[PDB]
Amino acid sequence: SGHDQSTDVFSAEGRVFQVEYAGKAVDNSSTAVAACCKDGVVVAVEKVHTSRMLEKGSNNRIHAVDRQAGICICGLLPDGRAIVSRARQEAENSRDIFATPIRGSVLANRVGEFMHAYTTHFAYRPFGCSAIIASYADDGPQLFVSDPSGTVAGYYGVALGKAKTVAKSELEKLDFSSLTCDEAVGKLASILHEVHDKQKDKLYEVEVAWVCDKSDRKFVHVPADMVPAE
């Protein structure tokens, strides 16, 4: 009825549907995965190209927020670019005012309050996006996920997207304590080529990015020849 038309309406049992309807925009989106590898964090996503003529590098869902942190989004691409352009502004404030790099748990708590502030007012709609904050600050390697409700949580590994239930069981076979960033790019990319089917889309490729001690604590994308072929 009229109990699911905006954000400032609790249900008869205390639920907000426009937040929960925005969570179905992430569950119908492409598959995301991540891993914390005891000296860094590796994040991989699958770009579903809708045409053969797209340039390699188009629609990259991984964006660098600071030198040590970067947010990969899962859900709607243009809604997540408002989260990226906000968390960059949160990370520029700590460098310019407090003369310090932003911590991993503090950048994620600023993302979860920007995403929550658009779920409490009638004129605004929640994001169709789950943001994955991968950071390496002076509190170690961090891996956070902010859902459209504004809930942040530290993870060791995460699967998000359509086949987030099959890819979650494929993460339970990894270690995360002896796991390094050297092997996990080959492992996490091999999750995506097994969890995802080619009988719906013909064009699908993977985009991996890390931040670890080997890359001098810098959030970078891959050199193109480290990813497995298929």
Next chain:
Amino acid sequence: TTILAVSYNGGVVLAADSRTSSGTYVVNRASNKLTKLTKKIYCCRSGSAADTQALAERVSNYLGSYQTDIGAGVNVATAANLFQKMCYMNRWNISAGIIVAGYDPINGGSVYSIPSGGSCVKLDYALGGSGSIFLYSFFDANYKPGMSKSECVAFCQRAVAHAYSRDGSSGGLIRTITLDADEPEDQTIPWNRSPYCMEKDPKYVTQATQNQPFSSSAKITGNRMSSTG
């Protein structure tokens, strides 16, 4: 006002006098120019007594609101960029020389000198105030880096005592505090137990022979202390 902060291996030693003076009259002879920002980060405080007090408790509220949201300790470089931001966008309206020194577990002991112009310079030792111009040639000769905690306390107390002996603006007590990995230890030595004073300096005992007796020769024989002889 004579303020200074000197680094040793563990942490820093803050040192200051105690006198606010309205031009020529001692309004307060027991001032406290060592202002607490957080538990391990203080600042020395020179210049205008009102303009630097309003900055010191505006930074200390941004800095404690930061510490609660972070959930960890505050770096000294964080506190020294909140004075530089405020002393630069108010530099035509305030009179503020600030020396920020403290301790953090990442960088150890840090000393930042923020002059009246609003710049920020990270140092080994800093000087400030109107009485600091006496202490440059005193630290060029008598200061060797790498002292212990007990040696930096007795040096900075001996450093301030040479400063307010010549300076008219400075004087009173000597308030020192050390900021390192232990608890912050403060110490206030008075004037009458100061390590230096010109009144008990044994080379200023002889009066300068100004008031010569009326005599027959050019032989200078000291002052005239009596009406008869």
